[PDB]
Structure formats: structure tokens, C-alpha cells
């Protein structure tokens, strides 16, 4: 039973490792998107004010 | 004569605002050309992660 | 407007300050080299978040959904946010990124 439980325990640790790996890959893409969004805001909304 | 002084003061303040805003905007302009060593990115959006 | 320019100029000046990170020579046990404040602050803030994430991870594996552990989680997130914000206000973004590279 212990082996089965611990086999299941290992399965849980592996299923979690899979989720974390997927989660960290998504965060990397989100950071890249946030950097572009901030740059786009400065170019489209702030830089045009000095001329006005 | 008083209105001429006041007019100079008002022109100065208007120019100060123009200079102030130009200075302020210089902080937001990304130095395209790698070369210029000097302008250290102030913002993390400009940070080269 | 002048007040704002002064604030951004102060941040630029702070960003030009080279933060020296000590070379990880493995062997060399002891030398007590002092850890830069930015690296300390960033490490602490990252540790605090790590503990928080680890706690969520442990709870997911031990099926014992103890129903009382949510209020403590929030407080811990807020604490992290506040601390994180403080870090972003106290140090320059280039220094914070450098600290993250080193970590």
C-alpha cells in the first residue's frame, strides 16, 4: 500500500512538475508582452504631448 | 510699463513649462543607437532583459 | 513639472551606480564578502514568494484541504506586494534586473 501510495505520491509530484514547467513558460511570454505594452504606451500616449 | 513686465514674466513662465516638459520627455526616449554609452535606461520597460 | 523631472533625474543618477556582484569561486569557504543591498532585498522578496508558492505546493500534495489556511495566504501575498513595491521604489530597475541575473 505504501508503494502504491508513494507511487501515487510520485505521480502527484510529476503532475505538479508538469504544471510548473507549463506555468513558467507562460510567465516568460507574459513578461515579454508587458514590456511591449509599456513601450507602446510611452510611444503612443506620452511622447506626442511636448508638441501640443 | 507694468504690463510689459508682466508680459515678460508670462512669456518666461510659458517657456519654462515648454523646457520643463521637453526635459521630462527626454527621460522616456529609448536611445535607438547602441553607441551612446551615456543614457542609462531609467525605466524597466527599456531594460534589456 | 520641475518636481517630476527632479525625481526622474534622481533615478537616472542611481542607475549609473555599478553594483559589483562577488565571483562564486566554489572552493573559497569563508570570505565574508558583504552582499549588495539590492541583491539582499531582491533575494528576500524572491524567498518570501518562493515560501508562499512552496506552501501552496505542499498543501496540494497533502489532500488535507485544511479549510482555514486561505486568510493567511492573502496576507502573505499582500505582504509580498508591499515588499515588492518597496523594492521597486528603493532600487533602480537596472540594479534589480542585475540582481535577478545573479540569483
Distance separating alpha carbons of residues B14 and B30, to the nearest angstrom: 27
Angle at which helices C93-102 and C2-15 pack, to 10 degrees? Answer: 30
Q: Chain A residue closest to B15 (CA)?
A: A50
CB-closest option in C1, C4, C15 to B40: C15
Count of residues in chain B: 49
Structure-determination approach: cryo-EM
The three-state (H, E, C) secondary structure of C8-46, written as one string = HHHHHHHHCCCCCCCCCCCCCCCCCCCCCHHHHHHHHHH
Measured in angstroms, the CA of B38 and the nearest CA of chain C are apart by 9
Entry resolution (Å): 33.0
Per CB-CB distance under 8 Å, the chain B contacts of C96 are 44
For cell 506555468, the residue is: A23
Count of residues in chain C: 103
Amino acid at each position: 500500500q505504501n508503494i502504491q501510495e508513494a507511487c501515487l505520491l510520485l505521480d502527484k509530484k510529476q503532475k505538479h512538475i508538469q504544471i510548473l514547467i507549463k506555468g513558467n513558460s507562460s510567465s516568460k511570454s507574459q513578461i515579454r508582452r508587458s514590456s511591449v505594452e509599456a513601450q507602446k504606451y510611452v510611444q503612443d500616449k506620452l511622447l506626442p504631448w511636448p508638441q501640443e | 510699463h507694468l504690463l510689459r513686465v508682466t508680459n515678460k514674466k508670462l512669456n518666461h513662465e510659458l517657456q519654462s513649462i515648454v523646457n520643463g516638459v521637453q526635459t521630462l520627455m527626454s527621460f522616456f526616449s529609448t536611445p535607438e543607437t547602441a553607441c551612446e554609452l551615456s543614457s542609462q535606461p531609467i525605466f524597466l520597460s527599456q531594460l534589456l532583459l | 513639472i520641475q518636481y517630476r523631472c527632479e525625481q526622474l533625474q534622481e533615478i537616472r543618477r542611481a542607475s549609473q551606480r555599478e553594483v559589483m556582484f562577488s565571483a562564486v569561486d566554489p572552493d573559497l569557504s569563508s570570505s565574508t564578502f558583504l552582499e549588495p543591498e539590492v541583491l539582499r532585498d531582491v533575494r528576500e522578496v524572491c524567498k518570501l514568494r518562493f515560501k508562499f508558492l512552496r506552501s501552496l505546493h505542499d498543501d496540494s500534495i497533502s489532500s488535507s484541504v485544511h479549510p482555514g489556511k486561505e486568510d493567511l495566504r492573502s496576507l502573505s501575498h499582500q505582504q509580498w506586494m508591499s515588499m515588492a513595491e518597496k523594492v521597486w521604489n528603493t532600487h533602480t530597475p537596472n540594479h534589480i534586473l542585475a540582481a535577478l541575473e545573479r540569483l
